[PDB]
């Protein structure tokens, strides 16, 4: 089975190994599309304490294709990790980062106490809002929240609050108050052709042997030998007159190999009459002595 060279990997490294994460009130989103779904760095990172999927099991996620994958990146407290899920309520689930209750995808989180703390007040969350968020809504307004009946007129005061509060993230905080880096990978399948598929490894290509072949999406057989054909830059394989693949351009080498059938032919016994001799010779018709 032959696959093309694996290039243009999906930027999971950039999302998970990021220098900085956004505040939960203003979570970042990166679009992942038209790339290879290489999750090997997420298979056993050791550092991930939380790994749960609402879409499909992670052991199938690596094979099946999607049209779009979105990476939502933010920092929350350890006790807030519970809220990054379908069916949840709370200050994060309702005012900072809302998932669909029918959400498909995976939530991954890890302790970042040695990365995102010192206090580190660069991480903020929404404490006040008039109503909750819609799924994947990002409310980054700084307008003063009016809790009372008296107009705030743009400033804080009695029953008037700045809607975004900072976290006192410190290296000496208890675990529930330490910062955690959360990446949510939102996965969808549309009517559109899927573009984000898992990587597949190629089998060593062997010439001059009778083999079952699979080149990209084309199933073949027979024996491959060096071709003297020149294909146009966009062509992947060629054909003979009777709807038969004649040659294939290999996905990795860009070399073309001709396809011959595995040797076959009738078997004939050449004999004198049994009246004078029981000695026989055997003729393998239309084949090579190296195949018999």
């Amino acid at each position, epitope marked *: 089975v032959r696959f093309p060279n694996i290039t243009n990997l999906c930027p999971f490294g950039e999302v998970f190994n990021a220098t900085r994460f956004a505040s939960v009130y203003a979570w970042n989103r990166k679009r992942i599309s038209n790339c290879v779904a290489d999750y*090997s760095v997420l*298979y*056993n990172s050791a550092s991930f304490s939380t*790994f*749960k*999927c*609402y*879409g*499909v*099991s*992670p*052991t*199938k996620l*690596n094979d*099946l294709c999607f049209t779009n994958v979105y990476a939502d990146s933010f920092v929350i407290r350890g006790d807030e990790v519970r809220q990054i899920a*379908p*069916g949840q309520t709370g200050k994060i689930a309702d005012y900072n980062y809302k998932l669909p*209750d*029918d959400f*498909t995808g995976c939530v991954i989180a890890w302790n970042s106490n040695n990365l995102d703390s010192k206090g580190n007040y660069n991480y903020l969350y929404r404490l006040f809002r008039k109503s909750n968020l819609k799924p994947f809504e990002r409310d980054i307004s700084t307008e003063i929240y009016q809790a009372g009946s008296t107009p705030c007129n743009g400033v804080e005061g009695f029953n008037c609050y700045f809607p975004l509060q900072s976290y006192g993230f410190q290296p000496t905080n208890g675990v529930g108050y330490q910062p955690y880096r959360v990446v949510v990978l939102s996965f969808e399948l549309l009517h559109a052709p899927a573009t984000v598929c898992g990587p597949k490894k190629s089998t060593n290509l062997v010439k001059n042997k009778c083999v079952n072949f699979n080149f990209n999406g084309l199933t073949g057989t027979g024996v491959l030998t060096e071709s003297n054909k020149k294909f146009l830059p966009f062509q992947q394989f060629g054909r003979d007159i009777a709807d038969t693949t004649d040659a294939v351009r290999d996905p990795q080498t860009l070399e073309i190999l001709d396809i011959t059938p595995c040797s076959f032919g009738g078997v004939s016994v050449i004999t004198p009459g049994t009246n004078t001799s029981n000695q026989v010779a055997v003729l393998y018709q239309d084949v090579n002595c190296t195949e018999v």
Partner: antibody
Amino acid sequence: VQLVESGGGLVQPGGSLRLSCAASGFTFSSYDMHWVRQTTGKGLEWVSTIGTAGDTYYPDSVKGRFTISREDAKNSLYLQMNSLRAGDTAVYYCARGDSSGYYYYFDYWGQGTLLTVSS
Amino acid sequence: IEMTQSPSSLSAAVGDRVTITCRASQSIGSYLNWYQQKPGKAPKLLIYAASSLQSGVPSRFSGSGSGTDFTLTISSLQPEDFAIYYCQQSYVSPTYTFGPGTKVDIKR
């Protein structure tokens, strides 16, 4: 398809047990293998999994105590359970997972083996 | 996610229709599996993905449901269907969990 558990027996609290499961009738290397346990008074619980990519997952009560491994060359599944507690007494089973589209289910189980933890 | 089954014990005669319900603490879409475990035996898969019947499962078995409320149905209970039945949420992986189980007894 057949699945046969072994390695069950008596262990003290604070000790360890090594379980195994023989895989036959299927391409073991192509399937996600799981362990589950059935505890009297609680019902059937999932314990661990190992994928074909070598990835592993555990529930929070197990993380850090149990290690799951597989030897594809021998069609044999293993679970090394250390730091055992009395609450780990259960019948442990090996199982094969499978799927249809985006839906996952368990399809095959062995007969299970009983693990008893007591001083 | 937690699953609750009802009744904990179902009493029905051979030939009776048997219905077992399972409720999710939150929506699980159509991601629910059902299993049948005979005494002294490991569980068998009956229904997966809410309503898909598994091969090898008698046509007497069917079921449906979505969101939080699901039901398994046996059109006509047989003596061999004396078993403990379980529902399993499959929405949240890797931590697959089962409900408390419904024991189906033969009514006399």
